[PDB]
Ligand binder design. Structure first.
Ligand SMILES: *[C@@H]1O[C@H](CO)[C@@H](O[C@@H]2O[C@H](CO)[C@@H](O[C@H]3O[C@H](CO)[C@@H](O)[C@H](O)[C@@H]3O)[C@H](O)[C@H]2NC(C)=O)[C@H](O)[C@H]1NC(C)=O
Ligand SMILES: CCCCCCCCCCCCCCCC(=O)O
Ligand SMILES: CCCCCCCCCCCCCCCC(=O)O
Ligand SMILES: *[C@@H]1O[C@H](CO)[C@@H](O)[C@H](O)[C@H]1NC(C)=O
Ligand SMILES: *[C@@H]1O[C@H](CO)[C@@H](O)[C@H](O)[C@H]1NC(C)=O
Ligand SMILES: *[C@@H]1O[C@H](CO)[C@@H](O)[C@H](O)[C@H]1NC(C)=O
Ligand SMILES: *[C@@H]1O[C@H](CO)[C@@H](O)[C@H](O)[C@H]1NC(C)=O
Ligand SMILES: *[C@@H]1O[C@H](CO)[C@@H](O)[C@H](O)[C@H]1NC(C)=O
Ligand SMILES: *[C@@H]1O[C@H](CO)[C@@H](O)[C@H](O)[C@H]1NC(C)=O
Ligand SMILES: *[C@@H]1O[C@H](CO)[C@@H](O)[C@H](O)[C@H]1NC(C)=O
Ligand SMILES: *[C@@H]1O[C@H](CO)[C@@H](O)[C@H](O)[C@H]1NC(C)=O
Lengths: 151, 400
């Protein structure tokens, strides 16, 4: 019901930090987490595919709780649902505008736009589409990096 | 007195009935637009609004006869719808309906006022910027007055009315249903409104401020005294108000009483304690101490419309504080009705009102982010006036 800060402040901070964390998985463990067609198992990557898989489920659960408080707003426009509201708010072009206006970092926007483009974005919103994509990448990660010491 | 008590009743064949269905007086509505001289200085630096008045832009109004006239023999009431129409008089105007003015961007001020939810303000900001809308805009007279499709509102993904305009809609509309006493059973009740849209109260205001009192001000019950307070309902300001005796006047040989709209009607509960229920909030009104303005947002679908007198006559100095270029004058900007005391008929009047919109700063809407104060922005002011025709004036003193 209340977060560390105002719901509006928390909402955008969480969205921003999850998008950043999604990028940081590649910046830190891209030898494991990538879209490279060549499926060769790298030593020590299995462990990292599991942590990345764990993170996806943690964010999916956190997101569910955030969507639940959004649906409790009593000042939303008349004849419009909380879900159409959420969906409009998280459409790629508006999402990137709000993040940039709040953080003022254009390069961070470039990285996010690239991440969303490669996710097929660029269970209903952008965040949901991305968390679904993340679940498929962590599953692909485990199918390639099946063992910490390949084979 | 005897011939009066019968020719004043609102029923078929009387002098009051013919003049009631369709007036013998030509009514004009002259507009003056407040043309914004420093839109960028206001928007960027939160400076005072430099205005220049442009006008008159004159329209012939109230030329249409009353419609769906239906007498009720039971309660001695007569019902109607008053159709609305405006015909431009290029002959009586300073310019064309095509004249351009820099004016407050109406949709931006209203949407920012109405939608306070910060997630909504974030969608709206994006939409205001994509349509390259700003705090001010350039509109023709025809658009500002009667309506335009707003490019920002046209993008709003939830249901909104995308046409904006100060008097939108006007043509092809009708104000009613008004139910008035015909005065058959008691002449002291002729033309006083029984109901308007089936109610005795507007549901706009709380307590006594919500009451629909008096006539429509086109006539009042006969045998008017100088000690009398004349009550009347004006749907354009969304409340009942009153007029009070000023002076004796001779109109084309007809001795009439000049009734005026007193400054007290506009006073705060500090000067006038009865006006408490016309104070809508405690911030803009500075704890209900500001005066000369009326927040009519409840009857304008939440839009921050503020009615005042032209050039903020009879208004608090804080209301006039952020505007440069106004010159109030009691004689010039007041409202008055010249009433013939025997019949109770209004033979001449001048109804002078100013239309304003409140605009506040915003954290999320960039175009209002630099504002350092709230502004009650004067949009235009009008003089709706009519005088008895020479022929009708000579027919009056002869037939009455
Ligand atoms: C509707 O109300 C208008 C505002 O009161 C009114 O216009 C004003 O009319 C007076 C004349 O009656 C003008 O004042 C004149 O005063 C001196 C003395 O003659 C002259 O030196 C001035 O130049 C001026 O002519 C006001 O200036 C004028 N105000 C504006 C802003 O136009 C209308 O005439 C009224 N409408 C009708 C049709 O009655
Ligand atoms: C004669 C007195 C009545 C005055 C009424 C003036 C009406 C002004 C309204 C301007 C439209 C503003 C934009 C609407 C946007 C929205 O409602 O969301
Ligand atoms: C015979 C023609 C009759 C038409 C008379 C119409 C008179 C209406 C008077 C209403 C005045 C009140 C509204 C103005 C208030 C203001 O100045 O803010
Ligand atoms: C705003 O103020 C600055 C001075 O502080 C001035 O240079 C600038 O011209 C002003 N802006 C406008 C649009 O008048
Ligand atoms: C008024 O009269 C017309 C006559 O054609 C009728 O059809 C209409 O319903 C009436 N108007 C209203 C709004 O009641
Ligand atoms: C309103 O109707 C009159 C008469 O038909 C016409 O002159 C005027 O242009 C119309 N106004 C608008 C805004 O269409
Ligand atoms: C108002 O501006 C528009 C657009 O520039 C123009 O077409 C129109 O002619 C202007 N009005 C007048 C009276 O010139
Ligand atoms: C006539 O009506 C008025 C109110 O409008 C009332 O005060 C008065 O008593 C009535 N007169 C009679 C004779 O009923
Ligand atoms: C109108 O409102 C007042 C409250 O101030 C009340 O006394 C009156 O009875 C109401 N009128 C009707 C007919 O409901
Ligand atoms: C309406 O008339 C009643 C009775 O005189 C009065 O108490 C009330 O204040 C009036 N209301 C308005 C808004 O003028
Ligand atoms: C001013 O507002 C406060 C509450 O915020 C209240 O105590 C005070 O009496 C108000 N003053 C007047 C005269 O309305």
């Amino acid at each position: 019901e209340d977060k560390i800060m105002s719901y509006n402040a928390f909402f955008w901070m969480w969205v921003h930090d999850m998008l950043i964390d999604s990028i940081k998985w590649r910046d830190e463990h891209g030898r494991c987490i990538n879209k490279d067609k060549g499926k060769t198992c790298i030593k020590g990557c299995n462990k990292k595919c599991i942590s990345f898989q764990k993170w996806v489920e943690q964010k999916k659960t956190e997101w569910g709780k955030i969507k639940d408080h959004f649906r409790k707003q009593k000042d939303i426009p008349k004849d419009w649902t909380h879900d159409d509201f959420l969906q409009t708010l998280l459409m790629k072009d508006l999402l990137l505008e709000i993040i940039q206006d709040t953080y003022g970092d254009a390069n961070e926007i470039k990285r996010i736009e690239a991440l969303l483009e490669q996710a097929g974005v660029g269970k209903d919103t952008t965040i949901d589409k991305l968390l679904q994509h993340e679940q498929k990448e962590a599953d692909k990660c485990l199918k390639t990096h099946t063992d910490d010491t390949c084979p | 007195q005897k011939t009066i008590k019968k020719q004043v009743v609102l029923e078929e064949g009387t002098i009051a009935f013919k003049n009631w269905v369709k007036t013998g007086t030509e009514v004009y509505r002259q507009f003056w637009i407040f043309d914004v001289q420093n839109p960028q200085e206001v928007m960027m630096n939160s400076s005072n609004i430099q205005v220049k008045q442009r006008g008159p832009y004159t329209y012939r109004v109230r030329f249409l006869a009353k419609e769906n006239v239906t007498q009720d023999a039971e309660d001695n009431t007569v019902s109607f719808l008053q159709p609305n129409g405006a015909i431009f008089e290029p002959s009586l105007s300073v310019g064309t309906e095509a004249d351009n003015f820099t004016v407050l961007n109406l949709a931006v001020a209203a949407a920012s006022h109405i939608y306070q939810n910060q997630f909504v303000q974030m969608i709206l900001n994006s939409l205001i910027n994509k349509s390259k809308s700003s705090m001010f805009q350039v509109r023709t007279l025809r658009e500002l007055l009667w309506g335009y499709r707003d490019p920002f509102l046209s993008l709003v993904p939830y249901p909104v009315t995308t046409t904006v305009g100060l008097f939108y809609p006007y043509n092809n509309t009708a104000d009613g249903v008004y139910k008035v006493f015909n005065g058959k059973d008691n002449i002291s009740k002729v033309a006083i409104i029984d109901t308007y849209k089936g109610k005795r109260n507007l549901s706009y205001w709380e307590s006594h401020c919500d009451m629909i009192n008096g006539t429509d001000a086109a006539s009042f019950p006969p045998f008017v005294e100088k000690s009398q307070v004349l009550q009347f309902f004006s749907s354009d300001i969304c409340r009942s108000i009153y007029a009070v005796f000023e002076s004796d006047v001779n109109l084309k040989g007809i001795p009439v009483y000049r009734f005026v709209l007193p400054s007290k009607a506009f006073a705060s509960p500090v000067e006038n304690p009865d006006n408490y229920c016309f104070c809508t909030e405690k911030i803009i009104s500075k704890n209900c101490t500001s005066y000369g303005v009326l927040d009519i947002s409840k009857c304008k679908e939440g839009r921050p419309v503020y009615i005042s007198l032209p050039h903020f006559l009879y208004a608090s100095p804080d209301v006039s504080e952020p505007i440069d270029g106004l010159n109030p004058n009691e004689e010039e900007h007041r409202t008055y009705l010249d009433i013939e005391p025997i019949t109770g008929f209004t033979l001449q009047f001048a109804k002078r009102l100013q239309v304003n919109l409140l605009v506040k700063p915003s954290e999320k809407i960039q175009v209002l982010k630099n504002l350092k104060r709230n502004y009650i922005v004067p949009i235009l002011w009008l003089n709706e006036t009519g005088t008895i025709g020479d022929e009708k004036a000579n027919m009056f003193r002869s037939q009455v």
